[PDB]
Nucleic acid binder design. Structure first.
Ligand SMILES: [Cl-]
Ligand SMILES: [Mg+2]
Ligand SMILES: [Mg+2]
Ligand code: NA
Ligand code: NA
Ligand code: NA
Length: 326
DNA sequence: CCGACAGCGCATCAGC
DNA sequence: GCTGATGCGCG
DNA sequence: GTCGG
């Protein structure tokens, strides 16, 4: 983190644009610049030096000059002092509360954690759970705990049907020493792009995980995506582990490689890669990579037998999960 | 300039 | 009930 | 806010 100060600033700007301005392209612009700068192997001495990097334009360069000179950014100083902006940014930290809901709550005079607690009747289900575990969802998960969680999920899945394959993705798969949550990619031979030969494939796994008290709450749930909450079991007399966010995604088995590429991320890496795919005349989602026709319409799914096959199509050297932390 | 900026599942709502 | 739009979340 | 054409 040679350039921690700068990337924090950019990230704070990004958050402002997303949460308050609701300007998503500005948000993405700031995130891209923060990311490109975070991997720059030199301590930055000037905006000019920074502007050499792709994603860092004139406006960001001037901000980096201001920051380097004074150690702060007036624009942010002001944003921090504004009550409405500060309140909105805060409320968006609750899972289920976005920019729109946040601004709406602020209108109604609901602007603090205390306000939320006393107005639970004004929250949808997801938001109520996000509030319930607000503190816990702030905490990172040590890889040691991720490992225990992996064992539980894989073993419980095995118990439901030995043919399931559960893979832990996200930052965990990228080798990080701590994770924001647990991402599980699930497959079963009875669910392919060709046919769904069994219903409740995701339900049964979710049910089994609730049975053993691993999954504690549900934010949302469909036939292919579960989003919820889980918790490690603690021993006699031990303080409980924090509750943790868990996402489970059921992907057609013959589409595993596109799925694991997606679920491994990072999010910025995915955006970069998919953007590059477009430039190369392909479109990539978690299911397939397809050529773009002359009209700009997706063609038929190209054959894929590894993650590297995807990189090959778009003429990128293969990058291991651990090098996709952008 | 000015168009493009990745892609998609689930929840909730409006309108029919 | 459905469809489509929008909010929010995931990487 | 940044970039490519
Ligand atoms: Cl924007
Ligand atoms: Mg994750
Ligand atoms: Mg994340
Ligand atoms: Na640049
Ligand atoms: Na939120
Ligand atoms: Na996740």
């Amino acid at each position: 983190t040679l350039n921690g100060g700068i990337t924090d600033m950019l990230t704070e700007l990004a958050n402002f644009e997303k949460n308050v301005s609701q300007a998503i392209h500005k948000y993405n612009a700031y995130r891209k610049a923060a990311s490109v700068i975070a991997k720059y192997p030199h301590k930055i001495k000037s905006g000019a030096e920074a502007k050499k990097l792709p994603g860092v334009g004139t406006k960001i360069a001037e901000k980096i000059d201001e920051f380097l000179a004074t150690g702060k950014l007036r624009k942010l100083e002001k944003i921090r002092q504004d009550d409405t902006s500060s309140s909105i940014n805060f409320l968006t930290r609750v899972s289920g509360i976005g920019p729109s809901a946040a601004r709406k709550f602020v209108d109604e005079g609901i602007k603090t954690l205390e306000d939320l607690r006393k107005n639970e009747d004004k929250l949808n289900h997801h938001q109520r759970i996000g509030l319930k575990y607000f503190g816990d969802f702030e905490k990172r998960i040590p890889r040691e705990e991720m490992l225990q969680m992996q064992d539980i999920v894989l073993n419980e899945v095995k118990k439901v049907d030995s043919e399931y394959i559960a893979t832990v993705c996200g930052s965990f798969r990228r080798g990080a020493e701590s994770s924001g949550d647990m991402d599980v990619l699930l497959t079963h031979p009875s669910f392919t792009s060709e046919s769904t030969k069994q219903p409740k494939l995701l339900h049964q796994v979710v049910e089994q995980l609730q049975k053993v008290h691993f999954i504690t709450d549900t934010l949302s749930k469909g036939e292919t995506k579960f989003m919820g909450v889980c918790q490690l079991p603690s021993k006699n007399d031990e303080k409980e582990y924090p509750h943790r966010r868990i996402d489970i995604r059921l992907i057609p088995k013959d589409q595993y490689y596109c799925g694991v590429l997606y679920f491994t991320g990072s999010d910025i890496f995915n955006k970069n890669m998919r953007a590059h795919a477009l430039e190369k005349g392909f479109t990539i989602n978690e299911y397939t990579i397809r050529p773009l026709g002359v009209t700009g319409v997706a063609g038929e799914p190209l054959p894929v037998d590894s993650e590297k096959d995807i990189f090959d199509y778009i003429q990128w050297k293969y990058r291991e999960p651990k090098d996709r932390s952008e």
